[PDB]
RNA sequence: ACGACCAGGGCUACACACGUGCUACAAUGGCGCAUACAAAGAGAAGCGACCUCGCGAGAGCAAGCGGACCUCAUAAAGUGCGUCGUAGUCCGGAUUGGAGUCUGCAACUCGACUCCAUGAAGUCGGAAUCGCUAGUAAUCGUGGAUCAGAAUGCCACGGUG
RNA sequence: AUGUUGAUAU
RNA sequence: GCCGAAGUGGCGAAAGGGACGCAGUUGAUUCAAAAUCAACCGUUGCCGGUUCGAGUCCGGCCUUCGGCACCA
RNA sequence: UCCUCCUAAAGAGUAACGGAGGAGCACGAAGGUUGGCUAAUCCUGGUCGGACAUCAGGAGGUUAGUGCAAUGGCAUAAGCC
C-alpha cells in the first residue's frame, strides 16, 4: 500500500506533468508482477521443483503454480507436460508489498549491484530483470540452502512506449544506471 | 554476520570470518577488529548488532568485493588492450612474471592437453 | 627385424 | 622496479632526441634501440619504432603506456604455436 | 486468496543500519536486521591516470 | 673473414616427454605469545653493531674488526601456555593485481627481496622405482665458494635421533 | 613349468 | 534382368533416448628390441522423411556380397 | 480381407501385376455431461538457460490440434482444462 498511495499522490502527478496526458486513465499503472523459476534440472529430481516452489513461496507470500513443458523437447530432455518451472502473479496489495520489498531491500543486498539495466525493455513499456541468487530475498535463511537458485521478475505495465515504461519506475527511484 | 554484503562465518573467530570477505586478509582483518576494539577470538556469533555495525564501517574503508574485483579485472584488461608484454601473457594464459614455460606452468595452462 | 639391432 | 629515489631512466641519447621530436613535431617515427627507456608523457603522440633484435616495431605512444618501458612492447621472441 | 495453501504473511519490522525503520508484510515470522537499503546504499545515494601517477611518484 | 669492435636480441621460447630436487596434502600439525641448548665458517671497493626512521624489504648516521677481541649472528627443531578441531580447513602457498626496496650505466624481454590483496592443484600418489646398517636413515636449522645483484643446486657444519 | 632376439664393415 | 543380405573406431567384427579384440598413443620393465605390465585415445555408407529425438523405423540412391535367370 | 486418396469423365458405381499410404487396435477415460478455455510460428525483454525449457509482452490468426493413414470435418469447436 505503501508505494501504491504513493502512485496515486505523487506519481501520477509526474507523469501527468511529464507526458501532458489528457486523461489520468492516460497515466501508466503497474498491471502486475510475475517472478518465474525455470527449474530445468528437476526433470533429474522432482524434489528439486518441491524446493524451488518453497523459495518462490517465501519471496512472495503465494503458492506458486507450477508450470510445465508446453511442447516435447529434444534438446532439453523435456516431454510435453513435464513439470520444469514455478511462477507466480502477484496484483493489488501484494505486488505493491513486494514492489516495495524489491526496491527498498532486496535489491541492495543484491552483491556488486551497480544499477539496473534501462535497456531491459520489451518494447511495450514492460520491465524484466535476472535475480541470481535467491539470497538477496531475507525470506530466504542462507543456512538452509540446497542449491543457490535465481528467478526472473517481470513488471508488466499498462505502459505503450518503453519511455512511458522506464518513467513510471524512475518515479518510485527504480534503480537504473 | 552480514558484512560487505557477504554472509560471513557465525561460528568462527572474528580474525578469521573476516577473511571470507574478498579483499581482507590476515592483517587487514587483524587492522579492522583493533579498530572496532573487538578481540579477535570472539567468535562472530557472540558480537552484537552494534558490533556488527561498526565492522561494517571498518571494512568500508577498504576496496573490497565487487569494487576491488573491477579493479582488478580493470587493472588486468588494461594489460591486455595495451599490447604490452604483461597483456600478451594474459591473453595465451602463460606465466606473466617471467616463470619458465619448457616446464610446469601447470597453473596457467592448466592440466595438460597431449598430442 | 626393425627393417634391420643392439641399440 | 627502479627505486623511487633514483626517478625514472630513460637513454640520454632517446631523451633529447624525443625532446627535439616534440619541439619540431610529430614526425617520421624514431627509431630507437633503447628499450630500457621508460615512457615520459612527452613521448605522447610519437611514433617510436623500438629494436626487438632484429626489426624496429613501431609503438605509438598513448597516455596508458607511460610508465611502461619501450620494450614491454616490442615482443623478441615469435611463437605461433606448435604444429601450425 | 484461497484459504490454507499460502504463507503466512504477516507484518514485520525491518531496522537497517543506517536507521532506516520499515514496516512491510513478509513471511519471513520475525522483525529483521538489515545490513543495508535503499535509502542509504552507495548506488541509491549516488556515493560510488598514468600520467598523474608518473608525475607523483617522480616530480623532477 | 670462420678474425675483430659495437648496440639490441637470444641462451629464460612451450601442444609436449623424462631425470634430479623443493614445498605440500596437515593435529607427531598450523597459528600466536614466552623461553632453552650448537657447530663450522666468512670479512677491507669487505663484514657492519649501537642509535634513529620505515608495517616491512630496507634507509640515514656511524663504532668496532684484517679478527679466540669486532661484525655477519636471533640457531631451528625443542620446551611452556593459549587457540584451531579434521574442514580443501586458521591445511597448502601456486597464480595473479596493486604498492615498494636494494644491487647495478640498465632489472621490458629476464633479478632477488618486502608489504597489501589474491588463495590454484594437492586429502599421501598406477605400473614401477630409489637411498640407507648408527650418531646412520629421518628430521631441524647454520655457514661457505661462485658472486655487483641473483640457490630449492653444490660444498661444508652442528641439533634431535 | 615356460621364457625370443641383438643390422654391415672395422 | 530379377531377388535377399549387409555398409559401424585404423583393421576385423558386436550392439527410438557407441562397446569388444588387435592396432595406435603415453608411461613402465630391458643394455636394447620383442613379449609383458600400467594408463589413454578414438565413434554408425549417402540423401530425404517419420519423430520432441534416428546408428536404430520408412523410402530412394550408391558400393559390396550371395541366390535366381527355367520350359522351349 | 479391411480403411483413405487419386485414376473415376462435377449424383452413385466403375478396371488393370495402375499411382500413393494405412489397419488386424487403443481408451473406465481418451466415454457421458456441466462449466470454463483457444492454437502453430516468429519477434522483443528476462537468473543459470544455449537455435529450442519456464516467465512477460507483441506480431500472427489455426500456418495448430485431432490416441494411430489419408480424406472430409471441426471455434457453437469435434481441439485444451
Ligand atoms: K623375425
Ligand atoms: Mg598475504
Ligand atoms: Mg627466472
Ligand atoms: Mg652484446
Ligand atoms: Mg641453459
Ligand atoms: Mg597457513
Ligand atoms: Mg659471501
Ligand atoms: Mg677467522
Ligand atoms: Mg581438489
Ligand atoms: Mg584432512
Ligand atoms: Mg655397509
Ligand atoms: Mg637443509
Ligand atoms: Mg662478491
Ligand atoms: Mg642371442
Ligand atoms: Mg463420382
Ligand atoms: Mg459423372
Ligand atoms: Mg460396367
Ligand atoms: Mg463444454
Ligand atoms: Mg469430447
Ligand atoms: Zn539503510
Known amino acids: ?177 | ?115 | 627385424x626393425x627393417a634391420x639391432x643392439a641399440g | ?84 | 486468496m484461497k484459504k490454507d495453501i499460502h504463507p503466512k504473511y504477516e507484518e514485520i519490522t525491518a531496522s537497517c543500519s543506517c536507521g532506516n525503520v520499515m514496516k512491510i508484510r513478509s513471511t519471513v515470522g520475525h522483525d529483521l536486521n538489515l545490513d543495508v537499503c535503499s535509502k542509504c546504499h552507495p548506488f541509491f545515494t549516488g556515493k560510488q591516470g598514468r600520467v598523474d601517477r608518473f608525475n607523483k611518484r617522480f616530480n623532477i
Open chain 4, 1 to 84: 622496479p627502479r627505486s623511487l629515489k633514483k626517478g625514472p631512466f630513460i637513454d640520454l641519447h632517446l631523451l633529447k632526441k624525443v625532446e627535439k621530436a616534440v619541439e619540431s613535431g610529430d614526425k617520421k617515427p624514431l627509431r630507437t634501440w633503447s628499450r630500457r627507456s621508460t615512457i615520459f608523457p612527452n613521448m605522447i603522440g610519437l611514433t617510436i619504432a623500438v629494436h626487438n633484435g632484429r626489426q624496429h616495431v613501431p609503438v605509438f605512444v598513448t597516455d596508458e603506456m607511460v610508465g611502461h618501458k619501450l620494450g614491454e612492447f616490442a615482443p623478441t621472441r615469435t611463437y605461433r604455436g606448435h604444429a601450425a
Open chain 1, 1 to 177: 500500500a505503501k508505494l501504491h498511495d504513493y502512485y496515486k499522490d505523487e506519481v501520477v502527478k509526474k507523469l501527468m506533468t511529464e507526458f501532458n496526458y489528457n486523461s489520468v486513465m492516460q497515466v501508466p499503472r503497474v498491471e502486475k508482477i510475475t517472478l518465474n523459476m525455470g527449474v530445468g534440472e528437476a526433470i533429474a529430481d522432482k524434489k528439486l521443483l518441491d524446493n524451488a516452489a518453497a523459495d518462490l513461496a517465501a519471496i512472495s507470500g503465494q503458492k506458486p503454480l507450477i508450470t510445465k513443458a508446453r511442447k516435447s523437447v529434444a534438446g532439453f530432455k523435456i516431454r510435453q507436460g513435464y513439470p520444469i518451472g514455478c511462477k507466480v502473479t502477484l496484483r493489488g496489495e501484494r505486488m505493491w508489498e513486494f514492489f516495495e520489498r524489491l526496491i527498498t531491500i532486496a535489491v541492495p543486498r543484491i552483491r556488486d549491484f551497480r544499477g539496473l539495466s534501462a535497456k531491459s525493455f520489451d518494447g511495450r513499456g514492460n520491465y524484466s530483470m535476472g535475480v541470481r541468487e535467491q539470497i538477496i530475498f531475507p525470506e530466504i535463511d542462507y543456512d538452509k540452502v540446497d542449491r543457490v537458485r535465481g528467478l526472473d521478475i517481470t513488471i508488466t505495465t499498462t505502459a505503450k512506449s518503453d519511455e512511458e515504461g522506464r518513467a513510471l519506475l524512475a518515479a518510485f527511484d527504480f534503480p537504473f544506471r
Open chain 2, 1 to 115: 554476520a552480514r558484512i560487505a554484503g557477504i554472509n560471513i562465518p557465525d561460528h568462527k573467530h572474528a580474525v578469521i570470518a573476516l577473511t571470507s570477505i574478498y579483499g581482507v586478509g590476515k592483517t587487514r582483518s587483524k587492522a579492522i577488529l583493533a579498530a572496532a576494539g573487538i578481540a579477535e577470538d570472539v567468535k562472530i556469533s557472540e558480537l552484537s548488532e552494534g558490533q556488527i555495525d561498526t565492522l561494517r564501517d571498518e571494512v568500508a574503508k577498504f576496496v573490497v568485493e565487487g569494487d576491488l574485483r573491477r579493479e582488478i579485472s580493470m587493472s588486468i584488461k588494461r594489460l591486455m588492450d595495451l599490447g604490452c608484454y604483461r597483456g600478451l601473457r594474459h591473453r595465451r594464459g602463460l606465466p606473466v612474471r617471467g616463470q619458465r614455460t619448457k616446464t610446469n606452468a601447470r597453473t596457467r595452462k592448466g592440466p595438460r592437453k597431449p598430442i
